[PDB]
């Protein structure tokens, strides 16, 4: 049940990074799930680059993009997320609706 | 290179029931540090997922890219958010919480019954000439170690002022 | 077949019987006017020997020892 | 500029290794000395005739 | 039971350890269970011991610099703590500590403390070679 | 008939080897302690862990042993949720490193072409575990002591890494048997730590706090709060992270060795070794034996460097500790790689 | 804060604990309990204890009208150390009796 | 006509052990006799030349005693120096933190009685004893440096007369009792600024 | 790359070895400790309260270099494998690659960034 178990399972966390990025309340917890959804979709892109494509592997290549890709955004979210609690000293996100 | 035999499926349901628990202990535990370590559970789990699979680099790599420095940075940017113990007792936030619970399943539904209508292991019949090369003799190491820079020349030379561009920023906004 | 026994068994013996009673007596011989790698010495030895000096190390047995019949 | 740092970048670890080398080799005869410090409690020390204990 | 050995059948003698008692112990943990109870006295700094071990006898309490006479007149510790004993008891194991108007506890008062087992199952103790060794005191006494 | 798997039950799995493993490793933890307790309190002072029988050889054990009852205290204010929790990612972080390490001729536990790769990803996973534990608690000397060496190990990795990946440019290889093989040519002219000092010079010096060493700078001063996020940890949990300590310091010594020295090469070169006396008969336990001999005491000979650089110099302060993590070691463990590419260029 | 005398067998704890565990050591410090000798120094039986608990009144009530400073901490703990003296020197109770190191604070028995 | 007569023993004492099992905690116990750690504690005029125990004169890190700077750690502590009334709220918390395998002794005449603090002052404490119960009592002000390494052999053996029943001596009840107050409050007077 | 049965079996062994230590001490323990037990140690004051102790300002800069200047090596390795194995164009590649981050690091070096 390798290549049919697995990607039971990716759709099973892609929805749960989904629902903790809405009803998250803080930036950090939204940022987290953020990852997590990322981190979903690279699982279900490796177990399709094993099946197949082993010649020339097109998957491992862009996971390994993904990754960087995801460690740069959560580089900069928490770049981000210094001087909005630098200018509000507080970081509840759903209590800033200022620009509407 | 192959897995040991009928320890496989045992090695998968294991790791699927406790990253099933880790991603529900990431979405709803309250205490934001305690959320955080699950989800480097979840990824540590998830590495272990992509190790099971004879695809090396992508696994250890990952579990050294993410299960260490981008989880110490969450956790050193959890020292800046302060107030917890927010309310609880199902769906503690408004309706919302039910609004979603609700289109996230119909999202999932759609999905997971698109899935098992699709015969992957027919699917990998058709393609009978892409995983039979090898090259002729080549390790899963030196694969990569090519195949990145013989035809993925352009994203490569990219990614490197991405990686700049991010540092200056970052360093630019964190510091007041 | 026969004649293995004596050979796989002196050696093996000696690899445990002899170094455990007497690297107590060469480091409590020499322990504060040695020289700069002497300590090196039997140090080394504290592995080799093993099988057997762990077996003279402190583990010494004094069971009562049911006596002669 | 840089040259000044090109320049004195061998001289703070020349610096940093002829004082690590030199306490190194001089607490060498310290680790391996020739001195015997305090024996076992069966080696009390000597006691000249001025003291006080049980009256 | 090696202690067993030379303990319920002499009811005198002395204990000869090396002088780290990191093996003595053993020995005391298996004479809980016959009837044996634990007395350590540390002998050094009574007087004449027949009045510590029969008689009602004043010791003199620590002084707190004044108050002329005042001692609370003690009791002894060997009537009273077979009171307390149950009827189902062998023997008093009792450890002489410190074997080695005062009176100097010199052999003829282990003799004297070596009567009450007979007419206490006292152990005198003295350190010794690295083999722990007992030895009947009765016959080093005097 | 072959209803489920006829030969596949549970027969295809021994763990003979790896309780061998566990073994040794213990007791090398014992000649370890040993070795500090005994020189470290002895330059110019007494003798070590004497009465403990002969010497301290049953010592290590014996305070193990004392270590395990030591009634666990579990403080209130965080719980089994992440105590227990904390020093098991710490202890499993440097047991799985032992997998690739090899020891001699043909003693190698796998194979592994991603072996110093995975060494490297399992070394920066215990500042995680550091935190959480200094965290597990409440109060402080915990949450900063454990703040202070997370922060402060992740400063010298990236000279780790810069350093074995100029090693591994030159043996053309990720796996442990494969460098020592690049290594046994020359017997001592060939070995890395006189091709690349300048690598050979960051790695031994980022070991240092890689395993906490120091992470008290005096006798007497603490681990720089009171204590080294440990002070609750008062039974096994501190044994389990005496342990990591000494097992970090032995992964960082064997790992130096197999690398910049010949791993289980003679003073001349391993293969010299058979063709000079033109037959062998029975070398199989002879190399086996010799192999954990010119192995192990090469790492001994940093272990005795560390222990005395233990007193020669006061350890930095964590406000010195990261310049010369940042701003030292990170320029010339670039440039020493700058070099070896056009030195391995042709 | 928590700031009781706490010496041997006199606990006055300025702060509610009377669970297995106080839960922030202090359960913000509105009860003002007490536990009598965990050391187990004298073994209790509920009615010779009864006159101590009834005369915890007496000592909080009768006589407190100063402000929570450890004054009252020991102006409690003066007369704690000598009703348990008194009950002993009638003989009401005893002493430890267990495999401790079984310490005379007050010294041996005497013959009255 | 006994003046506070000792209680009966309730229990009549009566049992046997196997030796398979009984000597596991016999080695045990020897083993937690054989590697305790002092934990460091000194204040006053008896306390002084317990610093001349690490070196050359007198050497107690000779037997494994790895002096330890906490208290939930080791299991050892010397009330050297001598002891006030103050110093004492928080020292008795150091006995408080610490697992049950201590056996805590004294050391310094004038912590045992309060030798040569007992004419007439509000600050020192009559004993260490009417605190926390501990074991030996050492004399001495200085305590003599060799003495407390004698009483350290002696403690040593008290350990060794330990079984595998003796390990029950050390869980405790809770004699918590239900009374409140109805006083005033007192703000922290420790107030931390310059 | 042939069989990491021996590394599945090491996993599991490893990963029930500190369990098993906190069971084994478990068993043979004491039901005791029922102290005050909420204070942590090395502070005899008999302390409580307080938070905002972060000092965040300094630390996250250098967590966040790190991360950035962390994902040079995991594309090196690959590079740094197959060097000798194609010709010397991944040579220039990598040292365009590794140069780009260098001005990186001169920048955050020159601009107060990696500090007290």
Redesign the interface.
Known sequence: MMFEHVLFLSVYLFSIGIYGLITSRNMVRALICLELILNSINLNLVTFSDLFDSRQLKGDIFAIFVIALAAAEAAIGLSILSSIHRNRKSTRINQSNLLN | MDLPGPIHEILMLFGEFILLLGGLGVVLLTNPIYSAFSLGLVLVCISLFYFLLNSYFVAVAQLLIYVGAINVLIIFAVMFVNGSEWSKDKNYWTIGDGFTSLVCITFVFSLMTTIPDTSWYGILWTTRSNQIVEQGLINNVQQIGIHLATDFYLPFELISIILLVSLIGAITMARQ | ILGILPPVAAIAFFYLFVAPPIIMNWMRLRWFKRKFIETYLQFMFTYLFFPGLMLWAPFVNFRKFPRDK | PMVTGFMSYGQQTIRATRYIGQSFITTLSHTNRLPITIHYPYEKSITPERFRGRI | GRWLDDVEKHKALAIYPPHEGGYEGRYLNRLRYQGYYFLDLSARGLGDPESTLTK?HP?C?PSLGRQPVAR????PEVDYRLSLLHPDAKGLIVWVYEAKRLQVLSKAELQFLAMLPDLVRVIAECGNWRKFIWKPLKQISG | SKLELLKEVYGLISILPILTLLLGITIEVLVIVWLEREISASIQQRIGPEYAGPLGLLQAIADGTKLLFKEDILP?RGDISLFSIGPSIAVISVLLSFLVIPLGYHFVLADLSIGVFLWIAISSIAPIGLLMAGYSSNNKYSFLGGLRAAAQSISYEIPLTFCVLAISLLSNSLSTVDIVEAQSKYGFFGWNIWRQPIGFLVFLISSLAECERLPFDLPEAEEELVAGYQTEYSGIKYGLFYLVSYLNLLVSSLFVTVLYLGGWNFSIPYISFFDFFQMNKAVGILEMTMGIFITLTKAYLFLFISITIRWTLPRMRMDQLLNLGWKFLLPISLGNLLLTTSFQLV | ????????HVRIYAAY??????????TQTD?????????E?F??TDET?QMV?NE??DL??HY??????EY?LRLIGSDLEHYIRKL??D?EI??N?????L?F???????? | ?????????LLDQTSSNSVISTTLNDLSNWSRLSSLWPLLYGTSCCFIEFASLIGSRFDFDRYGLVPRSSPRQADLILTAGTVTMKM??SL??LYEQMPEPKYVIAMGACTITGGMFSTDSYSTVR?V???????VYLPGCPPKPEAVIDALTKLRKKISREIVE?RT?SQ?K?????????????R?THTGTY | LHEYDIFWTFLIIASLIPILAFSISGLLAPVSE??????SYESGI????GAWVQFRIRYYMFALVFVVFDVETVFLYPWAMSFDVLGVSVFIEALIFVLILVVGLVYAWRKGALEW
């Not at chain 7, 804060?1 to 041997?8: F, H, I, K």
């Not at chain 8, 809770?174 to 007192?186: A, E, G, I, N, Q």
């Open positions: 009602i010791v309490p609370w007149y003690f009791p | 209130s | 804060q928590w700031l009781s005398c706490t010496t041997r604990i009377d669970p297995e565990t106080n839960a922030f050591d202090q009860k003002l309990t007490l536990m009598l000798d965990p050391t120094e073994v209790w204890c608990y915890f009144q909080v009530d407190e009208g100063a402000p929570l400073s009252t002993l020197y003989g005893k002493y009796m267990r495999s401790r190191v310490n604070s007050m010294g041996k028995p005497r013959v009255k | 006509t006994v003046m506070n007569l000792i209680e009966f023993p004492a709220p008795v918390r004993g004893d009417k605190l926390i119960p501990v074991d003796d001596l405790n809770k004699r918590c009792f239900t009374t409140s107050h109805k006083l005033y409050v007192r922290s | 029922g102290p005050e037990k909420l204070s008999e302390p409580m309260g």
